[PDB]
Every structure is written in structure tokens, then in C-alpha cells.
Design a protein around this ligand. Structure first.
Ligand SMILES: Cc1cc(-c2ccn3nc(N)c(C(=O)N[C@H]4C[C@H](O)C4)c3n2)cc2c1C(=O)N([C@@H](C)C1CC1)C2
Length: 824
């Protein structure tokens, strides 16, 4: 009664939205959704192992790749256990568990200890080999030593949770109202997975602040034939589309929707925002439409060769390959043959007349005989397809979520962002996907941390979906535990402190930054640290890192038009061996949602390349959107742009080679940096060509002192950046060939073909990226299909990509120059 007052108040602040608010609704779905999610929360809180929940050991069951096996000498791993002062190095075999490693220590010198990593709140514990922890693999990858602190297991009490009809369907369009303002009409559609079943327009009246029709619109479709999730899509045109809004004809309690509705509309090729049951909360300025609904609840033969081959041909096509009327009818007639092929499912369930009850019944009868689907090896791409906008049946979407259950927590992180955005395609608030995210979020602190920030990011900058995500986020926070509630509170404060500074500082816009503006920043960062700021906080992009006090000397405003903040924190962990500060960039103004999605696809391409033992050394530096147009980015130490290397605005060839030569002390190291360059450049060439973001200016491409190339901004045409200065490191020039350039070619083709083996996964994540993260036509989605050379053999595709390399060779500097040329 009394204790709930402050706690709900608290939850609102972490969310950035009041989930008890009733100002922008016309039914109790969101409240029923809150009350519904209590069950899966309390089960997962009850079921989770309290010891391992606190430890959150970051583990994988995948094979350790062939490249990291070469780094291992003779079945031996050096691990350095530390006391408060002294430390000893242990020889360990990759197969050894935390337990077996702890037996070796006690013998050398009660088991109430755990091998915590130095500098980070990350642990080595549980029935897992030392090779199967992700932190150990990071050390082997980067060539770092493995440093550990023998200390106390953290008390699980810190993670404690608080207590608690054959008639036709019709709609009356009364009229439209707008406070402030050609002809105008209203188009009422009946939608199921953005497939228009039924459509009726009104008569075109003149456009004014009030336009009334009072017309019954009788549709073709009957009441009984309406499927669950069917979406009454009201739209206002004037030739051109101005406003839109949606209403679910069958509600969360399976009841037919009836009564008067004054729905406030959104304002302006398809987008994830167009599907939302959310009405516009800005009632002061928005367009409005009035409707009345007065209408009850929702309740063995040999196939020919040629048709079998015709059917198998249809299953073999990519997701974006459209099914004709003929293709669908074939898939349906032979649905029991189709059902034996898991890859058919998206096409099969796309080939269903969802506006007929008898057919949907048969579709549900078909989903019962699911032996092959349940037994099938998990395909994530195929699963993602069944959660996109094209599918809106609950039971269909459920079988996709069923396959996701088997994923490791390591795999959930790889797809978490895209799975969070997939919630936008759910017809109803409460869903199998939402519950899966919550359930896997509560089971694992790391997933839960990144879940919090993914939901909070959307809540801050999506009026279309903030209501939905908030209810989910409130449900996570109600079971995450006191420890994590405190951590999120400390993080949310720090971001709120820094959001104010960056907003005020920018006002004080010519590209050159003033000297006193830096001193003004340092004045405010003195002020912040003294009074309001918390002593430490978890780094949102890397929650293992505990960033403490703030190094005011090294902080500055960065020489850009958008004036981001170069920030630099001292580490909070005393066991931290390195004295190097935690560099963080904090930017404002840009919309990071789009780029954050592209980075997650880049992280996915790494894991594809890992499974085929290729280490292309991409950099997906920590990059989290922390709120409305603001986010924290990891500062890669020892890194600079190409443009600063060049301009030190002319163009030169030999400079990039000299920059590595000088910055590398020993000549033997320089070649390892050249090796790192050739891999990274190959990786960044392939990936940018696939995503269609290769044509880029030098300033947005960076390079480490250790030779690692990477990109920091995403958008005669060039397919990708392979300019002369890159090639001068590689050896070739003009019309010649070199050994490193042939190695570059070998990695690019092996990289390109590797990605082509997961063509469907890449296509669907690309398709989803454009729908969920943008203010998009089929032409836009159709690029990646052409870029991946769909339906073509490997030798044909090798030829394709090697020509794109030669296109960059033929043009050379021609495209780089045009940045400056078009500027005036
Ligand atoms: C603005 C920005 C800087 C970095 C970045 C990352 C790591 N590092 N390490 C360094 N040493 C630097 C660095 O010196 N950056 C200076 C910028 C130039 O003046 C040189 C760096 N930058 C990443 C992104 C951005 C940006 O907008 N993104 C977008 C694409 C994303 C949504 C937020 C990424």
C-alpha cells in the first residue's frame, strides 16, 4: 500500500514511461498484459539458480575455432591467479573446469572461492571447460594474458526480489476531426500480416477541420471468417496518404470489438510503425477519426514428379522471391508434402487464405502434425522469417518462438536486438516472443542488461511502440533483482547528467571548437562530479566494466559539426591491472537506432565467420543507444582516421604504409599489423558491399596502431573503399599484382561465400532492419539479394566479387575526390 508508492515511482524513472497511465488507450490490453506477465516472471525467478545468476558466467558450447587452436601451444593454457599482492602462473589444459583448476591451487600452496577476472565483474564458474568461457577466448584472440583474482562469491541475497455469425462485417465512419488544418476520403482496410483482405473507401468530400460522412461501409468479409489479429486499418488520403491508424477487430480476450471509438491518428513503401495498435498520444494537435462498431467471441496419395519438382523449386527460392497465385495454390493443395520441409513453412503459411475460417481450421489441423518441425535442427533465419511483418497468426508465430527456446544465452545476445525489434510485428501486446525475451532476460543478467537498454532506447524515441515495450520492461525490472535495479539507477543517472551537459555545451556552430568551450565543459564536469554524480556505474555497452571517477583533464568536446563528448573515466575496480582510463564517446543529435542495427549485423557476420574458422577482425566497438538520440560509444585506444593520417586536403599514395612503419617499433610487428589490415579491410569490404554502404568518405574510416581497420559512420559510384593507399600496403599498384593482394582476394572470396551460405538469415535481418529502424520500398530490400548473387554457383560468385575489386582499381581516387567537389 505505502511501500508500492515509491517503488512504482522508481520503476517509471528507469523506464522513462508511466505504465499505470490511462491517457492514451481505449481498452484494457496493456493492463491485462501487465497482469498476464506476472506468471512467467515469478516462474523464472523461482526456477533460476541464485548462485549462477549472481555469477552470470559468460559461456559458449561452440567449437573453439581452428585459428585459436594455433595460438595454443601444446594443450596448455597459462592462467595467473592473484592474491592481494603476490600471484602465481598455472599451466592448465583447455578441458579443465573452474573446479579442477581450483583443485590445483589449494594443493600448491575450504572451497568458498571463485575465479573472478581482474578489473571486471565477470566470473569463471560452473560445469564448463576453460576453453568454453568467452572471456578466455577474448584473451587468446587478442594475445592478452589471462589474469584472475581469487575472492569471495557474491551473496545471492543482493539479487532478492520484492513481494507482490454469417452476417457481413461493417463499420460506420462518422467523420474526421482536426483542430488545425483539395479533396479527402477515408480508406478502411481489413489487414492480416499486411495482406489486404477487404477494402472499402468513402465518397470524397472537401477537406476542412471537420468532415462528416456518417456512412456504413459494408465489407465483403463475414464475421465468423475474421481471424485473430485481424487489423482494421483506417487511412486518410487527399492520390496521397496523410494519416493512418489501426484497430484490432478481435481483442486480447477473443471478443469481437464493438462500440464507439474516437481514435487519434499518426501522420506521414512500408514500415513497422504502420502496423501499431497504439493511437497517437498528442490529442492537442493530432488528426482524429470516429467509428461505430455494432456486430460474440472467436471459437494419402503419390505426388507426380513434375509437380514435386515444381514444389521443391518454390521451396528453394529466397524469402523475397514472391509467390504467384499458382505457387500458393500448389503449396496449399500439397500442404502435407510441404509440411515435411521446414524451409517451406514461411512460403506455406504465406500461401494461406487467412480470411476463411474453414481454411484456418485446416491450417491449425496442419500445425498439430508438427513432428518434423519440432525435431528439425534449429534454423534462426527460418525462425526469424516466421516473426516478420508477413506473419500475424499467434499459433504460427508460436512455433518459431518454440525453436528459439533451444538457443544458448550466447546466441540470444547475437539476435537480442533484432528479437526486441521483432516485438513490433506482434499483433497483441502479450505474446510468446515478449514472454521469451522476459524469461531469458530474467534467467541471465547479461541478456537482462542489454534487454533493459534495448527496451529503454525504444521507449524514449518511439511513440508508436513505447507503451508496449514499457509494459515488458516494467515486467523485467520487477524480477531482475535489487542489485540490478541499483545498477540501472546509477547508469540512468550518469546518462541524465551527461545529457544535460552535451545539450548546454553545444549551444556555446562553426566546425572549429573554441578553447574556452573545452574549459566550460571541464567546469561542468567539475560541478557534476562534486554534487550529483554517483561514484561508479556499469558501462552500458560493456556491463563487465565498472567505470568510477571521471578524469577531467582528458575530457573534451570533439572537432565535429555534431560536437560529441570525448569522455574518459578512471576504473572503479582496484584489482584492475591496467592504469589506462575507460574512454567513452557520448554523442547527441544523431538517431543511433539505424546504426545500432547495422553493428548487430556486423557482430552476426563475425559469428558466421567464426563457425568457418575465419578471423576477419571486424570492430563492433561497444555502441549502445542510451535514450532519445543519445548514446555511449567505446573509445578504441590507439586509433585514428585515414583523413588525419593524410592531412598532416590533398591525396597521396604512400602515406598509410609510413604511418604503420613508424607507429610499429620492431619491423617484425609491422608485418603482423599489415596482416591485421588485410583481414580487416577484406572483412569491411565484403560486409559493406553486402549491406550496400561501401561508397564512403575517408574521415568515417579508422585504423588502430595495431593495423585494425574499422568504420565509424554509416549512410561515379564505388562498391566499397579499396583505394590506392590501402593497396600500397598490400603491394600492388595500378596494373600489377602482389602476394598480400592475392591473400586479400582469398580472404574476401572465403568471406563472401561464407556469408552466402547464410543468405536467408542475412536477407531477413536486412529486411527487418529497414522496417524496424527507419523514419521503405521493396527496391531497397531487394539490393542484398542481388549483392549476394542468389541462385548462383560459387565460382560464378567468386568472379562477381573479384570484378567489384577491379572496379575500385579502375576508379581509384575518382570517388574520394568528389566529397570535396560536391561540397561547393
Ligand atoms: C562519432 C563516432 C565515433 C566513433 C568512434 C569509435 C571508436 N573510436 N576510437 C577512437 N580513437 C575514436 C575517435 O578518435 N573518433 C574521432 C571521430 C573523429 O574526429 C575521430 C573513435 N570513434 C564511433 C561512432 C561514431 C558515430 O557517430 N557512430 C554511429 C554510426 C553510431 C550510432 C552511434 C559510431
Amino acid at each position: 500500500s505505502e511501500e508500492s508508492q515509491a517503488f512504482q515511482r522508481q520503476l517509471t524513472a528507469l523506464i522513462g514511461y508511466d505504465v499505470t497511465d490511462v491517457s492514451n488507450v481505449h481498452d484494457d490490453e496493456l493492463e491485462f498484459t501487465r497482469r498476464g506477465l506476472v506468471t512467467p516472471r515469478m516462474a523464472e525467478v523461482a526456477s533460476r539458480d541464485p548462485k549462477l545468476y549472481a555469477m552470470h558466467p559468460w559461456v559458449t558450447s561452440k567449437p573453439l575455432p581452428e585459428y585459436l587452436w594455433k595460438k595454443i601451444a601444446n594443450n596448455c593454457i597459462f592462467i595467473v591467479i592473484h592474491r592481494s599482492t603476490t600471484s602465481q602462473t598455472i599451466k592448465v589444459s583447455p578441458d579443465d573446469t573452474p573446479g579442477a583448476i581450483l583443485q590445483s591451487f589449494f594443493t600448491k600452496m575450504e572451497q568458498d572461492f571463485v575465479l573472478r577476472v581482474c578489473g571486471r565483474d565477470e566470473y569463471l564458474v560452473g560445469e564448463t571447460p576453460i576453453k568454453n568461457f568467452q572471456w578466455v577466448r577474448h584473451c587468446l584472440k587478442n594475445g592478452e594474458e589471462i589474469h584472475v583474482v581469487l575472492d569471495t562469491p557474491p551473496d545471492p541475497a543482493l539479487d532478492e526480489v520484492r513481494k507482490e455469425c454469417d452476417r457481413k462485417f461493417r463499420v460506420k465512419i462518422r467523420g474526421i476531426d482536426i483542430p488545425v488544418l483539395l479533396t479527402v476520403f477515408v480508406e478502411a482496410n481489413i489487414q492480416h500480416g499486411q495482406q489486404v483482405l477487404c477494402q472499402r473507401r468513402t465518397s470524397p468530400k472537401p477537406f476542412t477541420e471537420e468532415v462528416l460522412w456518417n456512412v456504413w461501409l459494408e465489407f465483403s468479409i463475414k464475421i465468423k471468417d475474421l481471424p485473430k489479429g485481424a487489423l482494421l486499418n483506417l487511412q486518410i488520403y487527399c492520390v496521397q496518404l496523410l494519416y493512418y491508424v489501426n484497430l484490432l477487430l478481435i481483442d486480447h480476450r477473443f471478443l469481437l470489438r464493438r462500440g464507439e471509438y474516437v481514435l487519434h491518428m499518426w501522420q506521414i513503401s512500408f514500415n513497422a510503425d504502420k502496423l501499431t495498435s497504439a493511437t497517437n498520444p498528442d490529442k492537442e494537435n493530432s488528426m482524429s477519426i470516429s467509428i461505430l462498431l455494432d456486430n460474440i467471441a472467436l471459437p494419402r496419395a503419390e505426388m507426380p514428379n513434375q509437380l514435386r519438382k515444381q514444389l521443391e523449386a518454390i521451396i528453394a527460392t529466397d524469402p523475397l522471391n514472391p509467390l504467384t497465385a499458382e505457387d500458393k495454390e500448389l503449396l496449399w493443395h500439397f500442404r502435407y508434402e510441404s509440411l515435411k520441409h521446414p524451409k517451406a513453412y514461411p512460403k506455406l503459411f504465406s500461401s494461406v487464405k487467412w480470411g476463411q475460417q474453414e481454411i484456418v481450421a485446416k491450417t491449425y489441423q496442419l500445425l498439430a502434425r508438427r513432428e518434423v518441425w519440432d525435431q528439425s535442427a534449429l534454423d534462426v533465419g527460418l525462425t526469424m522469417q516466421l516473426l516478420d511483418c508477413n506473419f500475424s497468426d499467434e499459433n504460427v508465430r508460436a512455433i518459431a518462438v518454440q525453436k528459439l527456446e533451444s538457443l544458448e544465452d550466447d546466441d540470444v545476445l547475437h539476435y537480442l536486438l533484432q528479437l526486441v525489434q521483432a516485438v513490433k510485428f506482434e499483433p497483441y501486446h502479450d505474446s510468446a516472443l515478449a514472454r521469451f525475451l522476459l524469461k531469458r532476460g530474467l534467467r541471465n543478467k547479461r541478456i537482462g542488461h542489454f534487454l533493459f537498454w534495448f527496451l529503454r532506447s525504444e521507449i524514449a524515441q518511439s511513440r508508436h511502440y513505447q507503451q508496449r515495450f514499457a509494459v515488458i520492461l516494467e515486467a523485467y525490472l520487477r524480477g531482475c533483482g535489487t542489485a540490478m535495479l541499483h545498477d540501472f539507477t546509477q547508469q540512468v543517472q550518469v546518462i541524465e547528467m551527461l545529457q544535460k551537459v552535451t545539450l548546454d555545451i553545444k549551444s556555446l556552430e562553426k566546425y572549429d571548437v573554441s578553447s574556452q568551450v573545452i574549459s566550460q565543459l571541464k567546469q561542468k564536469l567539475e560541478n557534476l562530479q562534486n554534487s550529483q554524480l554517483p561514484e561508479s556505474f556499469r558501462v552500458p555497452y560493456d556491463p563487465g566494466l565498472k567505470a568510477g571517477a571521471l578524469a577531467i583533464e582528458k575530457c573534451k568536446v570533439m572537432a565535429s559539426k555534431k560536437k560529441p563528448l570525448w569522455l574518459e573515466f578512471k576504473c572503479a575496480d582496484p584489482t584492475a591491472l591496467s592504469n589506462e582510463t575507460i574512454g567513452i564517446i557520448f554523442k547527441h543529435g544523431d538517431d543511433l537506432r539505424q546504426d545500432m542495427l547495422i553493428l548487430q549485423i556486423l557482430r552476426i557476420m563475425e559469428s558466421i565467420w567464426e563457425t568457418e574458422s575465419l578471423d576477419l577482425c571486424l570492430l563492433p566497438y561497444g555502441c549502445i543507444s542510451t535514450g532519445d538520440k543519445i548514446g555511449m560509444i567505446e573509445i578504441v585506444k590507439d586509433a585514428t582516421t585515414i583523413a588525419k593520417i593524410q592531412q598532416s586536403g590533398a591525396f597521396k599514395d604512400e602515406v598509410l604504409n609510413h604511418w604503420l612503419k613508424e607507429k610499429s617499433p620492431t619491423e617484425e610487428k609491422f608485418q603482423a599489423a599489415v596482416e591485421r589490415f588485410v583481414y580487416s579491410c577484406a572483412g569491411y569490404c565484403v560486409a559493406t558491399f553486402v549491406l550496400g554502404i561501401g561508397d564512403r568518405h575517408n574521415d568515417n574510416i579508422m585504423i588502430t596502431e595495431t593495423g585494425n581497420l574499422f568504420h565509424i559512420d554509416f549512410g561515379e559510384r564505388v562498391p566499397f573503399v579499396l583505394t590506392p593507399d590501402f593497396l600500397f600496403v598490400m603491394g600492388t599498384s595500378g596494373k600489377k599484382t602482389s602476394p598480400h593482394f592475392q591473400k586479400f582476394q582469398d580472404i574476401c572470396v572465403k568471406a563472401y561465400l561464407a556469408l552466402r551460405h547464410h543468405t536467408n538469415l542475412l536477407i531477413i535481418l536486412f529486411s527487418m532492419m529497414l522496417m524496424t529502424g527507419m523514419p521503405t520500398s521493396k527496391e531497397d530490400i531487394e539490393y542484398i539479394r542481388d549483392a549476394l548473387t542468389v541462385g548462383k554457383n560459387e565460382e560464378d560468385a567468386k568472379k562477381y566479387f573479384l570484378d567489384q575489386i577491379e572496379v575500385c582499381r579502375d576508379k581509384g581516387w575518382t570517388v574520394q575526390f568528389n566529397w570535396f567537389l560536391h561540397l561547393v
